[PDB]
Amino acid sequence: REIITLQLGQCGNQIGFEFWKQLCAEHGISPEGIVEEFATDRKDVFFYQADDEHYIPRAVLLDLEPRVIHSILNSPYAKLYNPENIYLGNNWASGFSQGEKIHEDIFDIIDREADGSDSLEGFVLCHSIAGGTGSGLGSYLLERLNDRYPKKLVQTYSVFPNQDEDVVVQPYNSLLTLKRLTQNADCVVVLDNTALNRIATDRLHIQNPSFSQINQLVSTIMSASTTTLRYPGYMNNDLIGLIASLIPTPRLHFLMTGYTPLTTDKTTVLDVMRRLLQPKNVMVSTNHCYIAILNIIQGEVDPTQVHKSLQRIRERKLANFIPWGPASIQVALSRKSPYLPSAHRVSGLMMANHTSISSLFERTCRQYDKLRKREAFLEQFRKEDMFKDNFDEMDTSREIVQQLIDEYHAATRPDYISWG
Amino acid sequence: LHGLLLDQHEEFFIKSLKQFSLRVEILPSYIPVRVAEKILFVGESVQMFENQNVLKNQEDTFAAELHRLKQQPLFSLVDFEQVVDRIRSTVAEHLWKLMVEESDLLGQLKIIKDFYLLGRGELFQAFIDTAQHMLKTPPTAVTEHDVNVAFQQSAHKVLLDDDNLLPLLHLTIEYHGSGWAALGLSYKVQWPLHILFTPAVLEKYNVVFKYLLSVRRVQAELQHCWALQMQRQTDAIKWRLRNHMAFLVDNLQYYLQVDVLESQFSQLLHQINSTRDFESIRLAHDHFLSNLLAQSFILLKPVFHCLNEILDLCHSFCSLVSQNLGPLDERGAAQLSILVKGFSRQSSLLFKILSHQINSDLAQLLLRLDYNKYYTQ
Amino acid sequence: NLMQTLKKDYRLVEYLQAMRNFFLDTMYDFYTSIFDQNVSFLNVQLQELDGLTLSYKVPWPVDIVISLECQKIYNQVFLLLLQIKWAKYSLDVLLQIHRMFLLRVKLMHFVNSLHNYIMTRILHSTGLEFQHQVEEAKDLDQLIKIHYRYLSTIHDRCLLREKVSFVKEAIMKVLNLALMFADGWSIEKMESDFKNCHMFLVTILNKAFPHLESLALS
């Protein structure tokens, strides 16, 4: 139905800013919100039909040590969204404690926008894992949202903290945030910063402005994932239907990101299907096997093309299977958006549940285990000591992520009547 | 050329839209049925558009031509067919112009797809959500107005506000020969398009609407139980596995239906925009209906006798699980094991049946046997 | 007029072009993948010794000129061709000492020359005359007859009609020579057999069906 998007932290407000600018350029609206003459669509998914003839998005603006949020303030896209709810770092414990002491009025801000829309489908959190500003406050707000409203969906667009990096408390912060992500979320969309960094340094020759270009990538992915909700189809006009097939069980709810053009700066469905199935057109970079894949395509699609393409995908076997059942790559067709640039006219994206993300999890667990065994990299942060003098939450998070790795490896098995 | 006759208890091999038909017996054996149908088409068409418009006036020229045929003996089919088809072409272009233009057919096809065939996902999903208790309750006369005004409120709720051809839509909960069982949708038809939409085509549309709405209804509530429990035992995690497991094959069923709707509707619309013949539009509707009736597989009883069960098992599971979020050792396990085994049975049976051989049916198998758990069956 | 509107719609030449292309470049690749079984496996490889399924339907106005028992003959020549291509690819996949390679030439030349004969001197010479005959047939009746007298002479030249106990068996046993040499890569005891069966073929073929002498002197 209707989605209320939450943005917090400098990185989260950055990706929310670029996503809102992307949807402003995509739909027929000005940066003030002035209606265009070209706009089967919907403008009520992220947008309220708001009360000065601007389709003002329902966005929660949160700031914590604002630097780039000031630049968001003096901007032409501050006439698109500002319901005036801006209310005030480098650690998970600091952001968690600061979010703890002021949960009341920001929950009232959440309540205001929850009363704002007529219907609700989910809460999409613009979040950065171990980003400092987003960290801690994001995990605490995740606890507040999932506890306060058990009837709705929680989505968290997340990065994986590896940017070729100094912060040595970052494995502890990412471990605690990942504990919150596994326990207090219905679905998590995870990307790798190093993968998008490699793709960006590949397609161009940029080295310094990597942040802004990564923002372009995640905003394009976020628009592409909700195109089937924003444009009326037949299925996944609600979030829970797209969330349902990829997630077989409440512990494996972490989804890989794919999108078959890495380019927007002739083509058929058959070629982009075989181009999608390689792990180097995946923007997230023993037996490793997908649980379930779902692909959504948008373009000038001949309906016979998806049919024989799926034929070729079967008898080639270029996708990793699921042992305990059928749960396979599903072909979904969506409408080509108005006022999008005419490159890669047939363009598809995929969301997939893969066991290969367990490797990235255990790598970060190994980094945490190294710094935890050495006992020289807690740095004695005062909020970390005052929050937990015994630091048993790190042990609990380690246990939870170990159970997560075991359940991943158990889902890898042909028997998943053996658990972890 | 008028639709008037002067017979006194006799026949001239013909028996608005009143007492017009041809019988094979009274028609002579050396005149074929082919030219006779063209004659009958001319008479019926001219009779239809002549009144209530208060039309063509080439009647005298055509009559002089026929009269010239009467003067010159005797019978030879080639002259007769030439003059009858010369009337037929002008009549057909006239009749086509009237029906397609004075009332638009294109908007009708758009509305019929948008509602009978579930072309508005958000409207129909909000309608399922809002009118839940209304459609759940057993049939009575006065619930039909409630579900109609809720269905109109959702149309305004998505922010597509439009008067005219939305009030022509109704939800008909009949009574005296759960409210979902007697649920229907209806649509009104104008006078030029009146002959095109006869009770049969809309009768089939209603059944398609019921099938698609049943699976769309099943999907959301299975998922609500699943997400409710996900947000929170061995019994617990088994149910979420099972929720997903049923949702899969059910979603694939609805997707095969999505495939046939796109592929056949493109042909229908494209044929309508590219023709100036009245008969070809009738034939386009014929092809559309026959293909759709085949692809639902309602013609064959066993696969139908299985898809009913696919909806049924999810209904029972959703009602049982929602009572207690905590574990059910109150004969929850007894139904849970039967549910997963019977889902295996029914999904395997429909998989076997889906295994002439239309293409779309054929590669619908080729999703799940990518990932090989019906390669083991 | 009837023959003209049979070559402007329902073109018999189109089905003819497809026919003799569904045996003999593309169908080489298909069968060489099978070198490295099952009847449903073949369907899915196809849609991507002897063997495969060869079938396509003819529309009814050309189904009264192309018989159902004409398809069986298409399959017969397909089978014979597949055995030669199998023997050729078994002898052309291999990467003692350098001595194995003389045994390679000693057999590979023989099957290659035979392949050149079977295609060019029969299936393309007789095909090239046959096309120039059918493009001047303006009758329903003669069109069947020239076709049957095209198959029944290629079926004679590539002999299958009778004396398959004096011609066919030699080709069958040199197919097993392909297997025996395929395994080894004893070796000397293979050309002792090859020189025996080659001379047996020549000493049988020396009396002549008459077209067989065109290889018995090569």
Coordinates of C-alpha atoms in Angstrom, one line a residue, chain A:
Chain A
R1 CA 0.0 0.0 0.0
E2 CA 1.7 3.1 1.3
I3 CA 5.4 3.2 2.4
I4 CA 6.8 5.6 5.0
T5 CA 10.5 6.1 4.5
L6 CA 12.8 6.8 7.4
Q7 CA 16.2 8.4 7.0
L8 CA 18.8 8.9 9.7
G9 CA 22.6 9.5 9.9
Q10 CA 24.7 11.4 7.4
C11 CA 25.0 8.5 5.1
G12 CA 21.4 7.6 5.5
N13 CA 20.2 11.1 4.8
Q14 CA 22.6 11.2 1.8
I15 CA 21.1 8.0 0.3
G16 CA 17.6 9.3 1.1
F17 CA 18.3 12.6 -0.5
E18 CA 19.5 11.0 -3.7
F19 CA 16.6 8.6 -3.7
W20 CA 14.1 11.4 -3.2
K21 CA 15.8 13.4 -6.0
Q22 CA 15.7 10.3 -8.2
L23 CA 12.0 9.8 -7.6
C24 CA 11.4 13.5 -8.1
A25 CA 13.1 13.3 -11.5
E26 CA 11.3 10.0 -12.3
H27 CA 7.7 11.0 -11.6
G28 CA 6.1 14.1 -13.0
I29 CA 6.9 16.6 -10.3
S30 CA 9.1 19.7 -9.9
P31 CA 11.5 20.1 -7.0
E32 CA 8.8 22.1 -5.4
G33 CA 6.3 19.4 -6.3
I34 CA 4.5 21.1 -9.2
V35 CA 2.5 18.6 -11.3
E36 CA 3.5 17.8 -14.9
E37 CA 1.3 17.0 -17.9
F38 CA 2.6 13.5 -18.4
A39 CA 1.7 12.3 -14.9
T40 CA -0.9 3.1 -15.3
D41 CA 1.0 4.6 -12.4
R42 CA 0.7 5.4 -8.7
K43 CA 1.9 8.5 -6.8
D44 CA 0.8 7.4 -3.3
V45 CA 3.4 4.9 -2.4
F46 CA 6.2 7.2 -1.1
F47 CA 4.2 10.4 -1.7
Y48 CA 1.4 11.9 0.2
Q49 CA -1.0 13.9 -2.0
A50 CA -0.1 16.8 0.2
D51 CA -1.9 20.0 0.9
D52 CA -0.2 22.6 -1.3
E53 CA -0.4 20.6 -4.6
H54 CA 3.0 19.2 -3.9
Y55 CA 3.3 15.4 -3.7
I56 CA 5.3 15.7 -0.5
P57 CA 7.0 12.4 0.5
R58 CA 6.5 11.1 4.0
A59 CA 10.1 11.2 5.2
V60 CA 11.4 11.4 8.7
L61 CA 14.4 13.8 8.8
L62 CA 16.8 12.9 11.5
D63 CA 20.1 14.6 12.1
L64 CA 23.1 13.7 14.3
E65 CA 26.1 16.0 14.0
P66 CA 24.8 17.5 10.7
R67 CA 27.2 18.5 8.0
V68 CA 25.7 17.3 4.7
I69 CA 22.2 17.7 6.2
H70 CA 22.8 21.4 6.2
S71 CA 23.4 21.1 2.5
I72 CA 20.2 19.2 2.2
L73 CA 18.5 22.1 3.9
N74 CA 19.5 24.9 1.5
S75 CA 18.4 22.9 -1.6
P76 CA 15.6 22.9 -4.2
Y77 CA 14.5 19.5 -2.9
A78 CA 13.8 21.0 0.5
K79 CA 10.7 22.3 -1.1
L80 CA 9.7 18.8 -2.1
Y81 CA 9.8 17.3 1.4
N82 CA 9.9 19.0 4.8
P83 CA 7.1 18.2 7.3
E84 CA 9.4 20.0 9.8
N85 CA 10.4 17.2 12.1
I86 CA 14.2 17.7 12.2
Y87 CA 15.5 16.9 15.6
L88 CA 19.0 16.2 16.9
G89 CA 27.9 10.1 16.1
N90 CA 31.2 8.2 15.7
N91 CA 30.2 5.2 17.8
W92 CA 27.4 2.7 18.2
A93 CA 27.1 3.2 22.0
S94 CA 26.9 7.0 21.7
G95 CA 24.2 6.9 19.0
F96 CA 22.3 4.2 20.9
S97 CA 22.4 6.1 24.2
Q98 CA 21.5 9.4 22.5
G99 CA 18.6 7.7 20.8
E100 CA 17.6 6.1 24.1
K101 CA 17.2 9.3 26.0
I102 CA 14.9 11.0 23.4
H103 CA 12.8 8.1 22.1
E104 CA 9.5 9.8 23.1
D105 CA 9.2 12.8 20.7
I106 CA 10.8 11.0 17.8
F107 CA 8.3 8.3 18.4
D108 CA 5.7 11.1 18.3
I109 CA 7.2 12.1 14.9
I110 CA 6.7 8.5 13.8
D111 CA 3.2 8.6 15.2
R112 CA 2.4 11.9 13.3
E113 CA 3.4 10.4 9.9
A114 CA 1.7 7.1 10.8
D115 CA -1.5 9.1 11.4
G116 CA -0.6 11.0 8.2
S117 CA -1.2 8.3 5.6
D118 CA -4.4 6.3 5.3
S119 CA -2.7 2.9 4.8
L120 CA 0.7 1.5 5.6
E121 CA 2.7 -1.3 4.2
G122 CA 6.2 -1.0 5.7
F123 CA 9.0 1.2 7.2
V124 CA 12.1 1.5 4.9
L125 CA 15.1 2.6 6.9
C126 CA 17.9 4.5 5.1
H127 CA 20.7 3.0 7.2
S128 CA 24.5 2.7 7.2
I129 CA 26.1 -0.2 9.1
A130 CA 28.9 1.1 11.3
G131 CA 28.6 4.5 9.7
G132 CA 29.0 6.2 13.1
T133 CA 26.2 8.6 12.7
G134 CA 23.7 6.0 11.6
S135 CA 25.0 3.4 13.9
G136 CA 23.5 2.8 17.4
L137 CA 20.6 5.2 16.8
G138 CA 19.5 3.1 13.9
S139 CA 19.7 -0.1 15.9
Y140 CA 17.8 1.5 18.8
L141 CA 15.1 2.9 16.5
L142 CA 14.9 -0.6 14.9
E143 CA 14.1 -2.0 18.4
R144 CA 11.5 0.8 18.9
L145 CA 9.8 0.2 15.6
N146 CA 9.6 -3.5 15.7
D147 CA 8.4 -3.5 19.4
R148 CA 5.9 -0.7 19.0
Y149 CA 4.3 -2.0 15.8
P150 CA 4.2 -5.8 15.3
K151 CA 1.7 -5.7 12.5
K152 CA 3.8 -3.9 9.8
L153 CA 7.0 -4.6 7.9
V154 CA 10.5 -3.3 8.7
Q155 CA 13.0 -2.9 5.8
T156 CA 16.6 -1.9 6.3
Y157 CA 18.7 -1.0 3.3
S158 CA 22.2 -1.7 4.6
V159 CA 25.8 -1.5 3.5
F160 CA 28.5 -3.9 4.4
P161 CA 31.3 -2.1 6.3
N162 CA 34.3 -2.7 4.1
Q163 CA 35.6 0.4 2.4
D164 CA 39.3 -0.6 2.1
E165 CA 40.0 1.3 5.4
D166 CA 41.0 4.6 11.5
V167 CA 38.2 2.9 13.4
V168 CA 38.9 -0.4 15.2
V169 CA 35.7 -0.4 17.2
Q170 CA 33.9 -0.9 13.8
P171 CA 33.6 -4.7 14.1
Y172 CA 32.0 -4.4 17.6
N173 CA 29.6 -1.8 16.2
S174 CA 28.7 -3.8 13.1
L175 CA 28.3 -7.0 15.3
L176 CA 25.9 -5.3 17.7
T177 CA 24.0 -3.7 14.8
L178 CA 23.8 -7.1 13.0
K179 CA 22.4 -8.6 16.2
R180 CA 19.7 -6.0 16.0
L181 CA 19.2 -6.6 12.3
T182 CA 18.7 -10.4 12.8
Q183 CA 16.4 -10.0 15.7
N184 CA 14.4 -6.8 15.1
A185 CA 13.8 -6.8 11.4
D186 CA 11.5 -8.7 9.0
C187 CA 13.8 -8.3 5.9
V188 CA 17.2 -6.7 5.3
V189 CA 18.6 -5.6 2.0
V190 CA 22.4 -5.7 2.2
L191 CA 25.0 -4.3 -0.2
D192 CA 28.8 -4.3 -0.1
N193 CA 30.7 -1.0 -0.2
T194 CA 33.8 -2.7 -1.7
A195 CA 31.7 -4.3 -4.5
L196 CA 30.1 -1.0 -5.5
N197 CA 33.6 0.6 -5.1
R198 CA 35.1 -1.9 -7.5
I199 CA 32.2 -1.4 -10.0
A200 CA 32.5 2.4 -9.8
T201 CA 36.3 2.3 -10.3
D202 CA 35.7 -0.1 -13.2
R203 CA 33.0 1.8 -15.2
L204 CA 34.7 5.2 -14.7
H205 CA 38.2 6.1 -13.5
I206 CA 37.0 7.9 -10.3
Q207 CA 38.9 7.5 -7.1
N208 CA 38.0 10.4 -4.9
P209 CA 34.2 11.0 -5.3
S210 CA 33.3 7.4 -4.7
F211 CA 30.6 8.2 -2.0
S212 CA 28.3 10.2 -4.3
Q213 CA 28.5 7.7 -7.2
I214 CA 27.7 4.8 -4.8
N215 CA 24.7 7.0 -3.7
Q216 CA 23.6 7.1 -7.4
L217 CA 23.8 3.3 -7.5
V218 CA 21.8 2.6 -4.3
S219 CA 19.2 5.2 -5.3
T220 CA 18.8 3.6 -8.7
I221 CA 18.5 0.1 -7.0
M222 CA 15.9 1.5 -4.5
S223 CA 13.8 3.0 -7.3
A224 CA 14.1 -0.2 -9.4
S225 CA 13.0 -2.4 -6.5
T226 CA 9.9 -0.4 -5.8
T227 CA 8.9 0.2 -9.4
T228 CA 6.6 -2.7 -9.2
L229 CA 4.9 -1.1 -6.2
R230 CA 4.8 2.4 -7.6
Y231 CA 3.5 1.2 -11.0
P232 CA 0.5 -1.2 -10.8
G233 CA 1.1 -4.7 -11.9
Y234 CA -0.4 -7.9 -10.8
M235 CA 1.9 -9.0 -7.9
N236 CA 4.3 -7.1 -5.6
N237 CA 2.1 -4.1 -5.5
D238 CA 2.6 -4.7 -1.7
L239 CA 6.0 -5.2 -0.1
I240 CA 5.2 -8.5 1.7
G241 CA 4.7 -10.4 -1.6
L242 CA 8.1 -9.6 -2.8
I243 CA 9.5 -10.2 0.7
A244 CA 7.7 -13.6 1.0
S245 CA 9.3 -15.8 -1.7
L246 CA 13.0 -14.9 -1.0
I247 CA 12.7 -15.4 2.8
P248 CA 11.9 -19.1 3.7
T249 CA 12.3 -18.6 7.5
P250 CA 12.7 -15.7 9.9
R251 CA 16.4 -16.1 10.2
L252 CA 17.4 -16.0 6.6
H253 CA 16.0 -12.6 5.6
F254 CA 19.1 -11.0 4.0
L255 CA 18.9 -10.4 0.3
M256 CA 21.6 -10.0 -2.4
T257 CA 21.3 -7.1 -4.9
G258 CA 21.5 -7.6 -8.6
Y259 CA 20.8 -5.3 -11.5
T260 CA 21.9 -6.4 -15.0
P261 CA 23.0 -3.1 -16.6
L262 CA 25.7 -1.6 -14.6
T263 CA 25.4 1.1 -17.3
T264 CA 23.0 3.9 -17.9
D265 CA 25.7 6.5 -18.7
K266 CA 19.2 -4.4 -29.5
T267 CA 18.9 -6.0 -26.0
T268 CA 16.7 -9.0 -25.3
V269 CA 15.5 -10.7 -22.1
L270 CA 17.5 -13.8 -23.0
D271 CA 20.9 -12.0 -23.0
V272 CA 20.2 -10.0 -19.8
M273 CA 19.1 -13.2 -18.0
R274 CA 22.4 -14.9 -18.8
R275 CA 24.2 -11.7 -18.0
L276 CA 22.4 -11.4 -14.7
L277 CA 23.3 -14.9 -13.5
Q278 CA 27.1 -14.3 -13.2
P279 CA 28.4 -13.3 -9.8
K280 CA 30.2 -10.3 -11.3
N281 CA 27.0 -8.6 -12.5
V282 CA 26.0 -9.0 -8.8
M283 CA 26.6 -5.8 -6.9
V284 CA 27.5 -7.8 -3.8
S285 CA 30.9 -9.3 -4.2
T286 CA 32.5 -25.4 -0.3
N287 CA 29.0 -25.5 -1.7
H288 CA 27.3 -22.1 -2.0
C289 CA 23.7 -22.2 -3.2
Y290 CA 20.9 -19.7 -3.4
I291 CA 17.8 -20.2 -1.4
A292 CA 15.5 -18.2 -3.8
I293 CA 16.0 -15.6 -6.5
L294 CA 13.5 -13.2 -7.8
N295 CA 14.1 -11.0 -10.9
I296 CA 12.0 -8.1 -12.1
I297 CA 12.4 -6.8 -15.6
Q298 CA 11.2 -3.5 -17.1
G299 CA 11.1 -2.7 -20.8
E300 CA 9.8 -3.5 -24.3
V301 CA 9.5 -7.2 -23.5
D302 CA 8.2 -9.6 -25.9
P303 CA 6.3 -12.1 -23.8
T304 CA 7.8 -15.2 -25.6
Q305 CA 11.3 -14.0 -24.7
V306 CA 11.0 -14.6 -20.9
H307 CA 9.5 -18.0 -21.7
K308 CA 12.4 -19.4 -23.8
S309 CA 14.9 -17.5 -21.7
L310 CA 13.7 -19.4 -18.7
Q311 CA 14.0 -22.5 -20.8
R312 CA 17.7 -21.7 -21.5
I313 CA 18.3 -20.9 -17.8
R314 CA 16.9 -24.3 -16.8
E315 CA 18.9 -26.5 -19.2
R316 CA 22.1 -24.5 -18.8
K317 CA 21.8 -24.5 -15.0
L318 CA 23.6 -21.2 -14.5
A319 CA 21.9 -20.4 -11.1
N320 CA 22.6 -22.0 -7.8
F321 CA 19.7 -24.3 -6.7
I322 CA 18.0 -25.0 -3.4
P323 CA 18.3 -28.5 -2.0
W324 CA 15.3 -28.7 0.4
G325 CA 12.6 -27.7 -2.0
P326 CA 11.7 -25.7 -5.0
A327 CA 12.4 -22.0 -4.7
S328 CA 13.9 -20.6 -7.9
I329 CA 14.4 -17.5 -10.0
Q330 CA 11.0 -16.0 -10.8
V331 CA 10.3 -13.8 -13.8
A332 CA 8.5 -10.6 -13.1
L333 CA 7.6 -8.0 -15.6
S334 CA 7.2 -4.3 -14.9
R335 CA 6.4 -1.1 -16.8
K336 CA 9.1 1.1 -18.2
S337 CA 9.0 4.4 -16.3
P338 CA 8.3 7.8 -17.9
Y339 CA 11.3 10.2 -18.3
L340 CA 14.0 7.6 -17.7
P341 CA 17.1 7.7 -20.0
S342 CA 16.8 5.5 -23.1
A343 CA 19.8 3.2 -22.5
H344 CA 19.4 -0.6 -21.9
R345 CA 15.7 -0.5 -23.1
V346 CA 15.3 -4.1 -21.7
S347 CA 16.6 -3.8 -18.1
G348 CA 16.2 -6.2 -15.2
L349 CA 17.2 -6.4 -11.6
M350 CA 17.3 -9.3 -9.1
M351 CA 16.9 -9.8 -5.4
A352 CA 18.1 -13.2 -4.1
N353 CA 18.7 -15.1 -0.9
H354 CA 22.2 -16.6 -1.1
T355 CA 24.2 -18.5 1.5
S356 CA 27.4 -16.7 0.2
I357 CA 26.7 -13.8 2.5
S358 CA 27.5 -16.1 5.4
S359 CA 31.2 -15.8 4.2
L360 CA 31.1 -12.1 4.5
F361 CA 29.4 -12.4 7.9
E362 CA 32.1 -14.8 9.2
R363 CA 34.8 -12.6 7.8
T364 CA 33.6 -9.7 9.9
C365 CA 33.1 -12.2 12.8
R366 CA 36.7 -13.2 12.3
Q367 CA 37.8 -9.6 12.5
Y368 CA 35.8 -9.1 15.6
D369 CA 37.2 -12.3 17.1
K370 CA 40.7 -11.1 16.4
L371 CA 40.2 -7.7 18.0
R372 CA 38.3 -9.3 20.8
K373 CA 41.0 -11.9 21.5
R374 CA 43.7 -9.2 21.5
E375 CA 41.7 -6.9 23.9
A376 CA 43.3 -3.7 22.7
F377 CA 40.7 -2.4 20.3
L378 CA 37.7 -1.5 22.5
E379 CA 39.6 1.8 22.9
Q380 CA 37.8 2.3 26.3
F381 CA 35.0 4.3 24.9
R382 CA 33.1 5.8 27.8
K383 CA 29.7 5.2 26.4
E384 CA 30.7 1.6 25.6
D385 CA 31.7 1.1 29.3
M386 CA 28.7 2.9 30.8
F387 CA 26.3 1.1 28.5
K388 CA 27.6 -2.3 29.4
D389 CA 30.4 -2.6 32.0
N390 CA 30.5 -6.3 31.5
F391 CA 30.2 -6.2 27.7
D392 CA 28.0 -9.2 27.6
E393 CA 26.0 -7.8 24.7
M394 CA 29.0 -8.5 22.5
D395 CA 28.9 -12.1 23.7
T396 CA 25.2 -12.3 23.1
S397 CA 25.5 -10.8 19.6
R398 CA 28.4 -13.3 18.9
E399 CA 26.1 -16.1 19.9
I400 CA 23.3 -14.9 17.8
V401 CA 25.5 -14.4 14.7
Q402 CA 27.0 -17.9 15.3
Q403 CA 23.5 -19.4 15.4
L404 CA 22.9 -17.4 12.2
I405 CA 26.0 -18.9 10.5
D406 CA 24.9 -22.3 11.7
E407 CA 21.4 -21.9 10.3
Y408 CA 22.9 -20.7 7.0
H409 CA 25.1 -23.8 6.8
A410 CA 22.1 -25.9 7.8
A411 CA 20.0 -24.4 5.0
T412 CA 22.9 -25.3 2.7
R413 CA 22.4 -28.9 3.6
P414 CA 19.9 -31.2 1.8
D415 CA 18.3 -31.7 5.2
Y416 CA 16.9 -28.6 6.9
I417 CA 15.3 -30.8 9.5
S418 CA 18.7 -30.1 11.2
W419 CA 18.8 -26.7 12.8
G420 CA 21.1 -24.2 14.5

